[PDB]
Every structure is written in C-alpha cells, then in structure tokens.
Design a protein around this ligand. Structure first.
Ligand SMILES: CC(C)OP(C)(=O)OC(C)C
Ligand SMILES: CC(C)OP(C)(=O)OC(C)C
Ligand SMILES: [Zn+2]
Ligand SMILES: [Zn+2]
Ligand SMILES: [Zn+2]
Ligand SMILES: [Zn+2]
Lengths: 329, 329
C-alpha cells in the first residue's frame, strides 16, 4: 500500500519515475560525522546533492532509492535534509555491504535479523525513519559471514514484505549463489533485485536469472573509463565497456521478453570516501549528467533503437513500484 | 600545563590518580547509535558506566584515559555525560585501532595526519571536545596500512605534544617494531606508551624497551580466564596467567629501576560489542571490581610485597601526569 521514505510513507502512485540504485554519499559508518572536511564540508556535500537531485527532478526523476547501508556510512539525517530541499522522494535502506566492522562481523544470523527488522520497523537510529529496502552484497564467492547476511536479509524480508537488492561481481556470476541462498530461505525471487548486472556481457547468465523471476538491476550504465585507460584506479572501478554497450543489455532483455524484470539506475553519488582521493572529480568528468544520465541519455537511446515509449515507462515506473511495494507471501 | 578532558582542560595537579588505558565501551564506529539495544539500551549502558566509575572514584581514582578511537566506536557525547554524572575526569583519544573502514584504509599518511590533528586541535566531530592522546595498534607484524598509521601518529604527536599509546601483541614483541617506526619519525620514546605489555613473561623484551625511554603499559592485570578454561572465547581473550603473575611484572620492572617508566591500568569497559555476545557477563564475573581493581587489589598486593607507598604513588600519580602533559620537542 505505502512505501517508506525518509519523509514518511507515500503511496505507490506518488513514486513515479524511480531510480532503484543510487547513493547520496559512498562512505563508511561514522565517517561523515567524524571527518566532514574530507568532503569540503557537510554543507558543501549537501548543496552538491541538492543541486544534483534538482537536475534529476527536472529531468523527470521523482524518487531515488539510496541503497547505502550502515557500513556505507548512510546518514539518514542527511538524506532527510536533501530530500526535503530537492523535493525528491528518497527511500532508505537497511542491510550490510562489504565493509562491516567487528561489531557486526561477529553477529549471528538471529542477531542480524533483529538489527535489520529494527531499521525497517522501528526506524534508523533514533530518527524514527524506516528503511524501505534491504541491501546485501558479495564480491565473488560469498564469505561465511556474507552467507549469514543474505539469510538475515531474507528473513527480514519475509517478515516485513520489504524487497532485497544486491551488489554483485556480475562477471563472477554472483547472482547465482545469491539466489541459491535466498531460495533456501523461502524468499520469492520477485522480491529480489540482482544488481550491477550490466557489468557483464553474458546474456546467458542474465536471462537465466530473469527466467527464474529475479529482477535484474542494470545500474552501472554510465560507468565507463573509456578514454581514461590512463587512470588505473578509474579503470578498475569503471571498466572499459562503453555506456552504449551496457545500455544495449537493456534492449536485449526486453527482446527476450523480460521487460517486467528490468530495473535501471546509475549507481551515482555526490561524495565518495570509500575509494581513492579525488575519484569524484573523475566521475563527474565522466558523467556530468549525474543521476539524470538515465532519463537524458539512456531512454532516448533506447527509443532510437526501437524501444516503445510505453515499454520505457514500464521499466522506469511500473517495475519499481511493483518491486518497492511491501509484499508478503 | 593543561590536559584536555571531555569536560574541558584541567591542570596537571587535578588529574590525580589516573588509569591510563581504559574504555567506557568497546564497539565500532556508529554502532552505539544504530543499535543501542545491543547493550540493553543507551541508558542502561550509561548507568552501568556511571556506577562503575563512582566505584572507582570511591576507591581513589580521579581520572581515566578512554583510549577508544573512532574505530573502537568512541562516542564522546557518551563520555561527556558519564564523566559529568560520576564526577570523574575522562581523557579522550584520537588515532586508529585495528578495525578501520575503507574510508580510512585508503587514506595516505598525510591525510591521516590531518585527521589526527583535527581531533586533537579542533575537536571530535562537532563537539569541540579535544583528544588528549593518540591511540595506535598492531597485532603482530605491522601491515602497510598500520605503518602509515604509526607515522601519522608520530607526526601528529610531534606537532601537538600529545602522547602516543599503543595496543600490542606483547608475545610477538610488537613494541620493537613500533619503536622503530616512531624513532624513524623523530618521536621521543618518552612520549610513547607500549601497552598490553603484561601480556608477556619476557622481561628482557620489556626491559630493553624501558631502557630506551619508552613507557611500558601494564594494563591487563585483571585479565585472566583462570578457572574458566571451560570457555574457549574467554580463554582466548583473557589468557590463563593469573592476575598475581601480571602484577608481579610491575614489581619486577621496579626492582630493575624503571619505576618512572611504568603505567598501570585494567583495560576495562562497560559494554563490548566487538567480541562474542555476552562476553561482558563473563568479564564482570571475572572482575567484579571493574576499574577499581587496581586500587583495591593491585596496590595493596604490591605494598604487601615490599613496594613502598611512595613508589606506588609515583606510578599512579606522577608517571601519568608527566606522560599526559603535552610536551613539545
Ligand atoms: C567502493 C566501491 C569499489 O564499491 P561500490 C561501487 O559498491 O561502492 C558503492 C558504495 C557506490
Ligand atoms: C577486541 C579485542 C580482542 O582487542 P582489544 C583488547 O584491543 O579490544 C579493546 C578495544 C577493548
Ligand atoms: Zn554496489
Ligand atoms: Zn551502489
Ligand atoms: Zn588494546
Ligand atoms: Zn584497550
């Protein structure tokens, strides 16, 4: 019925055009509060985000899902402030990424479940703001600990109806292992989005998952270091595939009949401390459009390639709504 | 002249009897704020802390140095509140322990130096509370990252006059490698305390460091899993040496003429999320006196073994004062 945002619940219809995998800032737990100057200042970062969000809004974006977890240094108060200022709905997340500290690493599946439930039902920290999605991650074969996270994610999802979204090493076919664990927990694939999937050309892997009912997250569209092979770091992070290559995966999937399972995003951010210093400058240079890249560049591209507008609408509006709506078995 | 506490600056004479290595809570960055229930509640935690500190106070303790760093989940606000409620001075720290997140791990020596200076000169987070010591750590051979931390620590210390305190794997003689790094930066050994030193029976290793001017932190006195071998985790953590054995190392160093180089503490805490669940219960069983363990058990013990009261005062009052007084080269 309603979706939880950092400004409160909204109805499904209010979501509109939704960006399913983004971040206001890519950092680490407590970092923003401890060293705000790393980003110039907390104010500068907030202003940058507001400007960026206003531009996306102008382009038609109504809602963004910030998949930053506790370990990504998610600052809900920051999200709330920019959401209000830019007038864009922001869905917050619970879960864990791949940089959990000891206090989390030593927890049991039952403990983690309570933590995720807390964030979803009671709210994040003492803000009362509730998470509307669960974010998990692997980078190749799951670690024992990651396995636990995935199972807790599944349990929390089963109890609340909130969807699960993931970070993968697409090349390594991570999605397969992820799906296995989720299924082992009784989780419906329809409540799951396998992300960073445009990161591989293996359409075999993609349609497999798709065929199984999973949602495929093509959210790295603008990530490309083409013309930046000069920069090791950037190259490592962005890849050398062009944006068009990635964009074409969307078309392929549609072509195979999997339009209802696609989710597109940019995996953009306004601040990034969990990487080399100054990487942001590099990113901004690569994609000055920021989060508006999708509506301004990708949609028209697909249009020109033959994709019916109607279909594009389904992918950017219908799919996200369906995915985000809390649903129990 | 003055020492920075969580309630502000105090004169040296005001420190009095000081415990140089303690913790209010052992956690991780942002954990206490995101999952207070882990400790029952923040209120419960604070109360436990206040009680414990009042007991130590009753015993004669005037000041404690909380060596919790950003990665130990140090919460200065929590420190300030308990300090106020118990009426015990608390010195906060900057530096990094062994659980740094990606945002920290990827920083250069220069960046780290900045961060450390920030905490000491400007203050922690947005509180204005300034650190009065730098905490570093190794657990066996230093990692490349740890070497940078050590260098930054030294530079920050050289610029401010604030002492450096460390966590070591004593049995592995970590102190030797730490000293080497420090000296390479030009730091005076007299500004450094090599901690967890009572964790080894190798007096030769201890005396060699003392001879060089370093301070030796005998801060694990009450850590003993004796009579609990039935518990792996605990044994693993506390060891099987008796408190008397550790205490005797204090007398040994004295006997060898290094009384001015000794610092003693408990390495106690009131909450501990960075270990197995329920570890606190075990610890409280092991040492019901908590931080008062030193004045209530150790001092008397030492007296009884021939250590003159005066010497005992020098160790618990004078050494810490000299150590803590910001001192530039
Ligand atoms: C740190 C990088 C290498 O991983 P990623 C792309 O998931 O980071 C998020 C936080 C944007
Ligand atoms: C986590 C343990 C094993 O290391 P330690 C003794 O430095 O922890 C402190 C911060 C209480
Ligand atoms: Zn990711
Ligand atoms: Zn992401
Ligand atoms: Zn330690
Ligand atoms: Zn300690």
């Amino acid at each position: 019925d309603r979706i939880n945002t950092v400004r409160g619940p909204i109805t499904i219809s209010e979501a509109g055009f939704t960006l399913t995998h983004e971040h206001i800032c890519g950092s680490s737990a407590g970092f923003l509060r401890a060293w705000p100057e790393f980003f110039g200042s907390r104010k500068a970062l907030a202003e940058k985000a507001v400007r960026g969000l206003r531009r996306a809004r102008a382009a038609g974006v109504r809602t963004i899902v910030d998949v930053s977890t506790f370990d990504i240094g998610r600052d809900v108060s920051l999200l709330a402030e920019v959401s209000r200022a830019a007038d864009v709905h922001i869905v917050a997340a619970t879960g864990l990424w791949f940089d959990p500290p000891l206090s989390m690493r030593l927890r049991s599946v039952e403990e983690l479940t309570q933590f995720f439930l807390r964030e979803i039902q009671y709210g994040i920290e003492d803000t009362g703001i509730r998470a509307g999605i669960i974010k998990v991650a692997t980078t190749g074969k799951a670690t024992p600990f990651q396995e636990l996270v995935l199972k807790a994610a599944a349990r929390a999802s089963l109890a609340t109806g909130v969807p699960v979204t993931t970070h993968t090493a697409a090349s390594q076919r991570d999605g397969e292992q992820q799906a296995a664990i989720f299924e082992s927990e009784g989780l419906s694939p329809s409540r799951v989005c396998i992300g960073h999937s445009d990161d591989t050309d293996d359409l075999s892997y993609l349609t497999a998952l798709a065929a199984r009912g999973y949602l495929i997250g093509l959210d790295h569209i603008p990530h490309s270091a083409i013309g930046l092979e000069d920069n090791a770091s950037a190259s490592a992070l962005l890849g050398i595939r062009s944006w068009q290559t990635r964009a074409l995966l969307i078309k392929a999937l549609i072509d195979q009949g999997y339009m209802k399972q696609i989710l597109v995003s940019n995996d953009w951010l306004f601040g990034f401390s969990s990487y080399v210093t100054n990487i942001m400058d590099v990113m901004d240079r690569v994609n000055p459009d920021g989060m508006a890249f999708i509506p301004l560049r990708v949609i028209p591209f697909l249009r020109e390639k033959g994709v019916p507008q109607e279909t594009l609408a389904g992918i950017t509006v219908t799919n996200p709504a369906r995915f985000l709506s809390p649903t129990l078995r």
